[PDB]
Design a protein around this ligand. Structure first.
Ligand code: AM6
Length: 256
């Protein structure tokens, strides 16, 4: 293959962009087709918006992080406008899905299931010594069979999902993902509502420093709430692993 193309290269002609799923800063995201019959998602780089290499580092990363619980890389097009193509999740973002007529009717059993699924994906990430840095419902995709996969739309880390040592020292580890995950759990159980209902960031900041944690969300299973508490332990080293988290969630799930 020529040097000016990636090992994962495909001709642009094999792709047809049909629907804009989101636009913005560094490019856009489209739902499309690969060779007509195969649905795909396509992230396109807004020229000059950021370095092509900078853009393409994400795909090089996904090359080493292939797993069924994570969005799979399909190919790339490295001639402007640069594209990164992945599989296509039909039910969109978890935050949006939890609000559709279907998502709203999801039982606590299904929710715990999806939580374990995400924990499973985070367990793989943990095993590979990678750090997500933005684990939230907004970065979780749902399939037509209602299965979840971790993603990162690459969108100042907004406080509410960011652990103390991260907000204060900029130090991110798999232990801060564990914290973010605890927050993700509130989104799941409340069908997508923003964490810390009615509190501004500095209020959340002052509360955590005092040792306070988020008020028990409405209708949240107390066992689930306590599991969230573990994710919010002061010392990063006292927070659990994702294998443990997946493990407990599977038990709550199989008990419901
Ligand atoms: C195109 C693309 C290219 C790349 C990526 N990359 C990632 O993730 C990613 C990045 C870094 C690290 C990691 C890892 F560590 F976890 F490995 C990942 C993993 C994501 C996408 C990417 O965004 N893919 C995608 C988008 N939409 C959909 N479906 C999708 C999304 C939203 C809706 N929506 C419903 C209709 N509503 C109008 C708009 C929202 C409907 C389908 N399915 C897949």
């Amino acid at each position: 293959k020529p040097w000016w193309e990636d090992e994962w290269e495909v001709p642009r002609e094999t792709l047809k962009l049909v629907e804009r799923l989101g636009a913005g800063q560094f490019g856009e995201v489209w739902m499309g087709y690969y060779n007509g019959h195969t649905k795909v998602a396509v992230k396109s780089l807004k020229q000059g918006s950021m370095s092509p290499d900078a853009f393409l580092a994400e795909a090089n990363l996904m090359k080493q992080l292939q797993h069924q619980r994570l969005v799979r890389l399909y190919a790339v097009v490295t001639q402007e406008p640069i594209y990164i193509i992945t599989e296509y999740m039909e039910n969109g973002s978890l935050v949006d899905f939890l609000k559709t007529p279907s998502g709203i009717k999801l039982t606590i059993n299904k929710l715990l299931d999806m939580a374990a699924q995400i924990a499973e994906g985070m367990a793989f990430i943990e095993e590979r010594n990678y750090i997500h840095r933005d684990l939230r419902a907004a970065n979780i995709l749902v399939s037509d069979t209602l299965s979840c996969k971790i993603a990162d739309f690459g969108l100042k880390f907004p406080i509410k999902w960011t652990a103390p040592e991260a907000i204060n020292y900029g130090t991110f580890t798999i232990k801060s993902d564990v914290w973010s995950f605890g927050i993700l759990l509130t989104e799941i159980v409340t069908h997508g509502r923003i964490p810390y209902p009615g509190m501004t960031n500095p209020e959340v900041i002052q509360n955590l420093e005092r040792g306070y944690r988020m008020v028990r969300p409405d209708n949240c299973p107390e066992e689930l709430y306590q599991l969230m508490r573990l994710c919010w332990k002061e010392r990063p080293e006292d927070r659990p692993t994702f294998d443990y988290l997946r493990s407990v969630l599977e038990d709550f799930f199989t008990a419901t």
